[PDB]
Design an enzyme around this catalytic site. Sequence first.
Site, short mmCIF file in Angstrom:
data_model
loop_
_atom_site.label_atom_id
_atom_site.label_comp_id
_atom_site.label_asym_id
_atom_site.label_seq_id
_atom_site.Cartn_x
_atom_site.Cartn_y
_atom_site.Cartn_z
N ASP B 62 0.74 -1.14 0.12
CA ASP B 62 0.05 0.10 -0.06
C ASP B 62 0.93 1.25 0.06
O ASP B 62 2.09 1.11 0.31
CB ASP B 62 -1.00 -0.03 1.10
CG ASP B 62 -0.19 0.05 2.61
OD1 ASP B 62 0.96 -0.15 2.85
OD2 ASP B 62 -0.85 0.57 3.54
N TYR B 64 2.62 5.34 0.96
CA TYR B 64 3.30 5.91 1.86
C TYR B 64 2.15 6.77 2.66
O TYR B 64 1.49 7.42 2.38
CB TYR B 64 4.51 6.55 1.33
CG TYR B 64 5.39 6.07 0.55
CD1 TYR B 64 6.37 5.08 1.31
CD2 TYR B 64 5.54 6.11 -0.90
CE1 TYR B 64 7.22 4.47 0.64
CE2 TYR B 64 6.87 5.26 -1.35
CZ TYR B 64 7.62 4.62 -0.75
OH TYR B 64 8.62 3.91 -1.20
N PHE B 75 6.48 2.43 -4.66
CA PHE B 75 7.93 2.68 -4.54
C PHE B 75 8.21 4.04 -4.55
O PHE B 75 8.86 4.44 -3.68
CB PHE B 75 8.87 1.48 -5.03
CG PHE B 75 8.69 0.24 -4.55
CD1 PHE B 75 9.38 0.00 -3.36
CD2 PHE B 75 8.15 -0.92 -5.27
CE1 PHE B 75 8.84 -1.39 -2.93
CE2 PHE B 75 8.00 -2.19 -4.73
CZ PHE B 75 8.32 -2.34 -3.52
N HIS B 185 11.64 -9.52 -0.11
CA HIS B 185 11.28 -7.94 -0.24
C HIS B 185 12.59 -7.25 -0.01
O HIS B 185 13.45 -7.56 0.75
CB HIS B 185 10.39 -7.61 0.76
CG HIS B 185 9.77 -6.28 0.45
ND1 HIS B 185 10.42 -5.10 0.90
CD2 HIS B 185 8.51 -5.94 0.06
CE1 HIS B 185 9.87 -4.03 0.38
NE2 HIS B 185 8.67 -4.63 -0.09
#
Lengths: 73, 226
Positions: B62, B64, B75, B185
Site C-alpha cells: 500500500d 506511503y 515505491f 522484499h
Amino acid sequence: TGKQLVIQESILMLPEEVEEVIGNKPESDILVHTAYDESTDENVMLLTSDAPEYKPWALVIQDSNGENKIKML
Amino acid sequence: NELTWHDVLAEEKQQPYFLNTLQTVASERQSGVTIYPPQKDVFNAFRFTELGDVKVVILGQDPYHGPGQAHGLAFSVRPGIAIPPSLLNMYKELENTIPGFTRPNHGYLESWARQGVLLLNTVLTVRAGQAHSHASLGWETFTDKVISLINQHREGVVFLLWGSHAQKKGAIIDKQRHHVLKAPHPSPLSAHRGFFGCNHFVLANQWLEQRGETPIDWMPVLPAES
C-alpha cells in the site's frame, strides 16, 4: 535535540518471513517500520503486529554492512 | 482486440465492491480524515502505463502514509522526499547489476512508468500515519482483477514479485504466458540474505531484447513543467 523518529515505510511480512531473519516466529502478520539515517548509515526497524493493533513485537538495529541488533519487546 | 484500461474496467468500475470502496474513501476524506494519495493521483499507475505498454510489473503493498511521499506509483516518492529504505536498496541492486547505472538523487520513478513499468500497489489508499489501514476496503479484489486481465489479454510480461506477500500469495500468473521472477522484499530487514544477489532488473531486460522488445532504462530521469 528531541525530535521525531521518522518512520519512512511500513512493510507487511508474513510470520515465516520474519522467523527467517529474527530466528523467532511472530504469531501473526508483522509490519516492518523503517527509519533511515545517513549520519550513522543505520536502519532502525520496529516490528509490530498488523493494523489496527500495531502491538510492538521487536526492535532491530542494522548497520552499514547488514549486521542486525535484535531485541524482543 | 480489447486493448486498453477500459478492459473490464468498464464493468469493474460499475461493480458494487468497487463503487463502495470509492465512496467509503470519499466519505472518509470529506469526514475529516486525510487519506493519502490525493484523489487526483490515486490512479496514476494506469495513467502513465497503458495496458498494451506493460512490459514489466512491479507489485507494491500500500502507499506511503507520510505527508508528501506517495503520488500513485509503487515505491516512488515525490521529487524531493528522502529515498525510502526499500527504494534505497533497490538502487543498490541497480548500482551493481546494471553497469551503465549510477544513482540519481531522488525516488521519483515516473520514468520507469512511461517505459512500460507498471508500479502497481495491491491496496491503493492509506490513512495518514496508519499503515494498511485501508486493507479491508476491496482494493485487493480490484487489484487482483487487474493482474488477471494482464495475465489474460497480454503476453510475455515480466512480473517482479518481491516478498512473500506480493510473490505468489496474490500472484498466480501463467508461468509461460509470462516471465515470473521471485525474490525476498528489498526491505533492510530482508534485503540482505535473499534480494541483493538477484539480477531481476538485468534479467527483466535480457528477456525483452530476447523477444526483440526494446529494453528498459532503469535509471531515473526528471522532468516537471511550468
